[PDB]
Amino acid sequence: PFCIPIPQVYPCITARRVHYAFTSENNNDSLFSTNAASIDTAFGENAAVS
């Protein structure tokens, strides 16, 4: 198992979270697209479909 915060489209502060396990490597290749139907994101400058 692995946990992901939902695709950032909010004007609001973030709440506290407790995480432990991190990958060695960026395995998010299986990701085709974030929140396709929005104009906008929020946090951690991501990419859209390639």
Binding site: I6, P7, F32, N35, A36, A37, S38
Partner: protein
């Protein structure tokens, strides 16, 4: 003659298996040539549009 399925496999002279199990090499496909679905894992949580 016919197709290679011998329905009458009832105590036939040719003991055990003599019947010509041929592969049907001809498998037709309408639709779309697909392997992988572009899957919308986490749909978009209700947005307002013009």
């Amino acid at each position: 003659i016919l197709s290679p399925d011998v329905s009458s496999k009832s105590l036939s002279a040719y003991l055990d298996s003599a019947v010509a199990n041929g592969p049907e090499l001809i498998i037709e496909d309408t639709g779309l040539c697909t392997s992988f679905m572009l899957l919308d894992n986490i749909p978009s949580a209700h947005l307002t549009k013009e």
